[PDB]
Write a protein that binds this ligand. Structure first.
Ligand code: SRM
Ligand code: SF4
Ligand SMILES: [Cl-]
Ligand SMILES: [Cl-]
Ligand SMILES: [K+]
Length: 538
């Protein structure tokens, strides 16, 4: 690869990072949006204050302001639901390691409550909160309210570093490798500039997903992250081996590969910065389907990319990977739902099933109440869109199990529900081909009525090829499509995926059967479970 290819393509100008004039040819429309006006100015220069005052019908009359609300606002975690909930915004947080408080939960509930039938909230596949129903005029007050309770929504969408995922059992599991919270906290603080905004990492060629591993279970899905920190001792020192470039897209799904790099634990932020700077400086900015970091790694080769990371490290030092990491390959992924003892004697955590991750304001208040009465006011989110309430004095468990709300958010739902994951789908998402959340619950309920089983089969439902619900990791995955019934009528369907494995022995699933009408999935799935997963007809 020629030396000219390694010239940084962006430069700092007045606090922000912009494409250099000579690298602007052939760029995609999103890159043009970023050049036309720096999205971070909406927050960092309080551009949102005046924008929020303009009636949305007027906003839609000019490209600049329409791009503000449809594109640039995603840098403030605000997502206009133009097609399916016009004039309303989904709002997405930074929530490193999935950790929330009862006060934060009540605040979020109070926001969605205002919007009535237009409001609700969702736990995401990055153990994060999304709230719904937000109107533009309310945005300045919501931003203030979030800050007041110690939350940020910065840089959660578009060409930004996404929610830092960690071990949902961090600090509490007797079997953890290393508490991931300090590291995911540091990453989030770095990414968001301590909630003020960090323009140095907000003009990436594309989204970028990080995780820090602290579990033998690999709850963090390191194989599908742009950067995964794998805990590893090297030459008597604790640190992390680095995996890079994992991603899913409509066009291509790839597992992360070794960078062949180990960093001491204190270098977590420095190496995150170095990798992001290399991606920012050198990444392709044409066809959006070829802008994820793995495409850069393929273009330079992993060694060429590694050299770019190395030159951006303090003292330009980057050690090679440790021959072994601390993750034990002899491991069975553990169920976290139900009551489990913590490493702190006399304390338990409880995992509660949240059906397809969907909650209303009243539900959130009740969960916050439980966390206060039984725990320490902490609620943890998981990437299967469930919750854990930690730090419960074990003597309180008997009373907790009798709480009425646990009939809805159960510590021991049927096994197929335990593993069920579903994206937003067409209730709110404009890209969705099908409805996902209600359908997946209905189908799963019918399937489980017909068969019993003991294997923890994981079913993932995603509404379009963006695969936000990660169908390629599922035992049985369902990707939304339109198909045809026996009479040739248009019906909702799914492409069915098999072969996904998680944990250390990970594998990406692939399409098994295309174009199955959703109304025909129950018998197909029942038979798959009996024939391949040991299920028994009732
Ligand atoms: C909420 C969530 C799914 C869920 O129900 O949990 C979600 C929802 C959306 N995703 Fe995603 N993605 C979610 C995790 C993912 C993941 C899974 C992951 O991170 O492990 C992926 C696949 C992994 C990956 O990115 O490598 C994913 C791949 C995408 C893509 C395809 C990326 C690509 O390279 O092509 C898009 C479209 C895009 O970015 O161009 C997308 C775009 C979208 C948008 C923002 C599209 C839009 O604006 O409507 C969706 C918002 C719908 C809504 O109203 O909720 N989403 N999205 C997840 C939020 C995570 C978070 O808290 O930050
Ligand atoms: S997979 Fe498609 S339908 Fe589901 S949330 Fe992502 S973009 Fe929307
Ligand atoms: Cl986005
Ligand atoms: Cl839309
Ligand atoms: K769930």
């Amino acid at each position: 690869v020629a030396a000219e290819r390694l010239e940084p393509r962006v430069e700092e100008k007045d606090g922000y990072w912009i494409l250099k004039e000579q690298f602007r040819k052939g760029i995609n429309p999103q890159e043009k949006v970023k050049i036309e006006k720096e999205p971070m100015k909406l927050f960092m220069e309080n551009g949102i204050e005046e924008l929020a005052k303009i009636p949305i019908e007027e906003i839609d009359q000019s490209k600049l302001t329409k791009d503000d609300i449809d594109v640039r606002l995603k840098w403030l975690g605000l997502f206009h639901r133009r097609k399916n909930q016009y004039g309303r915004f989904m709002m997405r947080l930074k929530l490193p390691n999935g950790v929330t408080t009862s006060a934060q939960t009540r605040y979020l509930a109070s926001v969605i409550r205002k919007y009535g039938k237009e409001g609700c909230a969702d736990i995401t596949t990055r153990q994060n909160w999304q709230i719904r129903g937000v109107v533009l005029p309310d945005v300045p007050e919501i931003l203030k309210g979030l800050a007041e309770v110690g939350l940020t929504s910065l840089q959660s969408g578009m060409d930004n570093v996404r929610n830092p995922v960690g071990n949902p059992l961090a600090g509490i599991d007797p079997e953890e490798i290393v508490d991931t919270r300090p590291y995911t906290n540091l990453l989030s603080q770095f990414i968001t500039g301590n909630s003020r905004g960090n323009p140095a990492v907000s003009n990436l060629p594309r989204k970028w997903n990080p995780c820090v591993v602290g579990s033998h279970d690999l709850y963090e899905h390191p194989h599908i992250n742009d950067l995964a920190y794998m805990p590893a001792t090297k030459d008597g020192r604790f640190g992390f081996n680095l995996l890079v470039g994992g991603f899913f897209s409509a066009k291509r799904c790839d597992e992360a590969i070794p960078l062949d790099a180990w960093v001491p634990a204190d270098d977590v932020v420095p190496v995150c910065r170095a990798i992001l700077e290399a991606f920012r400086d050198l990444g392709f900015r044409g066809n959006r389907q070829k802008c994820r970091m793995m495409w850069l790694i393929d273009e330079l080769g992993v060694e060429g990319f590694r050299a770019e990371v190395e030159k951006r490290m303090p003292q330009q030092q980057l050690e090679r990977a440790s021959p072994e990491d601390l993750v034990q390959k002899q491991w069975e992924r553990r169920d976290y739902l139900g009551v489990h003892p913590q490493k702190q004697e006399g304390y338990s955590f409880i995992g509660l099933h949240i059906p397809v991750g969907r909650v209303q304001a009243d539900d959130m208040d009740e969960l916050a109440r439980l966390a206060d009465e039984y725990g320490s006011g902490e609620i943890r989110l998981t990437v299967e869109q469930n919750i854990i309430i930690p730090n419960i004095e074990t003597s309180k468990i008997e009373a907790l199990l009798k709480e009425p709300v646990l009939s809805t958010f159960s510590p021991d739902p049927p096994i197929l529900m335990k593993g069920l994951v579903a994206c937003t789908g067409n209730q709110f998402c404009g890209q969705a081909i099908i409805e996902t959340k209600a359908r997946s619950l209905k189908i799963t309920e019918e399937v489980q009525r017909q068969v019993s089983l003991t294997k923890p089969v994981r079913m993932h439902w995603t509404g379009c090829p963006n695969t936000c619900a990660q169908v390629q990791v599922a035992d049985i995955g369902f990707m939304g499509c339109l198909t045809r019934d026996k009479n040739g009528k248009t019906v909702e369907g799914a492409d069915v995926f098999l072969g996904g494995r998680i944990g250390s022995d990970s594998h990406l699933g692939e399409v098994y059967k295309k174009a199955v009408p959703c109304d025909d999935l129950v018998p197909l799935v029942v038979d798959l479970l009996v024939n391949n997963f040991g299920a028994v007809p009732r």
